[PDB]
């Protein structure tokens, strides 16, 4: 699988990890994951789970103070990873001065994760018509990062808008024919890889004939037949043999120019049309 997991950022030279206080950063007091938890959220932001307070850079005076800010404001908060370090607003590294973190833009500082060699940035960001969730989100006057379970809905439910208080458009926390969920085929593939599964791989005619008579399924959807490798014709998501095809007689099926490089399946008659799957459309992945 491939999903975001809470972790802790520790210094390499000195055995100190990040600990947040009411408006600042304090000493390590580390090796206890009951309060110190950090995670990655959209717009390349860092979010604390317990304190529900994110860090940012407010460049307003001569000495920019590295304090806590609200994740819904004009603070211009985002951080990225250099070869062995962290740089924030403008080449500003999270420099350590034995207890407090400032921004002096020094080239001698390292940051790893808890008890393992990693640059804490090798895993990219992972996440109403089945749209991807927005993390974090402010509900009931509190910040939340994950699709929690309550007594209102059946299972986990998330928000599909940056401001749920003004839009009021929720969605199901998608962890399978998701009807009326129009997404891009690349978005569908990355979301189903986030779940650890792969696109539909048709091997025999029995599964296809079973899918023909299916009632709860869209008439038009994707299967995953695409050429991610530019030097070979057509493959599936996984490495499945290509022995069963259901191509279409109507279109001339231009190879690369004139047509496209994606396939779309029609179940009312069972055809595979050449098309571009960059637009939104339902799909299914096993």
């Amino acid at each position: 699988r491939a999903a975001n997991d809470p972790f802790t950022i520790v210094h390499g030279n000195t055995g100190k990890c990040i600990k947040p206080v009411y408006g600042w950063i304090v000493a390590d007091d580390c090796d206890e994951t009951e309060d110190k938890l950090w995670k990655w959220v959209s717009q390349h932001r860092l979010f604390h789970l317990h304190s529900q307070k994110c860090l940012g850079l407010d460049i307003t005076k001569s000495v920019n103070e590295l304090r806590m800010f609200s994740c819904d404001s004009s603070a211009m908060l985002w951080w990225k990873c250099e070869h062995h370090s962290l740089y924030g607003a403008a080449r500003y590294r999270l420099a350590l001065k034995d207890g407090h973190g400032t921004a002096i833009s020094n080239a001698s500082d390292v940051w790893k994760k808890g008890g393992s060699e990693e640059s804490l940035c090798d895993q990219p960001y992972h996440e109403s018509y089945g749209r991807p969730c927005e993390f974090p989100f402010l509900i009931d006057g509190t910040w939340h990062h994950d699709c929690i379970l309550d007594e209102d809905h059946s299972g986990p439910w998330c928000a599909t808008t940056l401001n749920y208080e003004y839009d009021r458009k929720w969605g199901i926390c998608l962890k399978q024919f998701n009807t009326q969920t129009a997404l891009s085929w690349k978005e569908a593939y990355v979301s189903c890889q986030n779940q650890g599964a792969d696109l539909l791989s048709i091997n025999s005619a029995a599964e296809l004939t079973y899918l023909k008579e299916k009632e709860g399924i869209a008439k038009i959807f994707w299967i995953g037949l695409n050429q991610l490798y530019s030097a070979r014709g057509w493959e599936w998501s996984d490495h499945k043999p290509l022995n069963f095809l259901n191509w279409d007689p109507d279109r001339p099926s231009a190879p690369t120019i004139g047509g496209s490089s994606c396939a779309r399946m029609d179940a009312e008659s069972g055809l595979w049309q050449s098309f571009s799957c960059e637009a939104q459309l339902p799909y299914v992945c096993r």
């Binding site: 206080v21 600042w24 304090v26 001065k97």
Partner: protein, 295 residues
């Protein structure tokens, strides 16, 4: 605010301009010196009509006791105030004045308010006590004047604050803590005073360079009421020399050429090692000479 260690005050018998001097986090930061002001110096402040210095502070306006305020603001992982730096003391005092109240400060002693100590575990390097005849209990508070009032803190103040962050070089010294009243003929008795204790015992003479720093580090141990340092330079043979029959090699003069012809004067040692001489007109500076000083 002229601390009587760098300025000579007596019957005064080329302009003079003053300045404020810093001594790199000294227990007497903010001294006032005087020199000729034809030179070039700096000016920063001009008068017209919470994080601080790598530390964090939290103030509560609740009326509660010392143990109670400790247990109250300690839930947020905070420790009570322990002054160890002059800038920290000044910031705490200006915050207390802005709050218009005398707030709590955290410390505790062990044996009848005799050995005071902060809750951090750092060697004592700062002393800003207020009076000597006020040590009735074993706690302290910060007053409006910016001093350390020794009281009992089992009461209710309008708020609290809590923060987060001898043989040496072939000679033997001694310290005497007694009460004396001899205020006459102080130039022909110290020799026979120290000679009665043990043979081969002469008054402190400086023949090295590391003894000054040693006695300086040894001084700030029982400085509750001790602030001045005495020397053995007196009127000897119509000159400023020691008591014994030996010439002087290490000059201990401030500037120019002193011409004190009186039978005695005040040779004082500064906070960092500035040679200072003070001519006296009244003998009411002997407190401070033999009772709680370096003999």
């Amino acid at each position: 605010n002229f601390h009587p260690l760098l300025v000579s005050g007596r019957l005064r018998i080329r302009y003079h301009c003053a300045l404020i001097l810093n001594l790199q986090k000294s227990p007497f930061t903010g001294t006032w010196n005087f020199t000729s002001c034809s030179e070039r110096h700096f000016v920063s402040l001009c008068q017209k009509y919470v994080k601080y210095l790598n530390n964090l502070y939290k103030i509560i306006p609740k009326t509660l006791t010392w143990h109670s305020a400790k247990r109250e603001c300690l839930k947020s992982n905070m420790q009570l105030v322990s002054i160890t730096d002059p800038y920290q003391q000044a910031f705490l005092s200006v915050q207390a004045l802005l709050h218009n109240s005398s707030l709590w400060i955290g410390l505790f002693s062990q044996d009848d308010e005799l050995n005071f100590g902060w809750s951090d575990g750092k060697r004592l390097h700062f002393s800003r006590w207020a009076e000597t005849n006020g040590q009735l209990e074993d706690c302290v508070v910060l007053d409006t004047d910016g001093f350390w009032k020794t009281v009992d803190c089992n009461d209710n103040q309008p708020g609290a604050i809590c923060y987060y962050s001898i043989p040496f070089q072939n000679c033997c010294y001694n310290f005497i803590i007694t009460k004396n009243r001899h205020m006459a003929t102080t130039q022909d008795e110290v020799h026979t005073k120290c000679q009665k204790l043990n043979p081969k015992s002469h008054i402190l003479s400086i023949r090295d360079e590391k003894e000054n720093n040693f006695v300086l580090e040894q001084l700030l141990y029982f400085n509750y009421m001790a602030s001045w340092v005495m020397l053995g330079i007196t009127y000897r043979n119509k000159s400023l020399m020691w008591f014994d029959k030996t010439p002087l090699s290490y000059t201990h003069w401030r500037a120019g050429r002193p011409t004190i012809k009186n039978e005695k004067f005040l040779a004082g040692l500064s906070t960092d090692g500035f040679w200072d001489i003070q001519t006296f007109k009244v003998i009411e500076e002997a407190v401070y000479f033999h009772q709680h000083s370096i003999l």
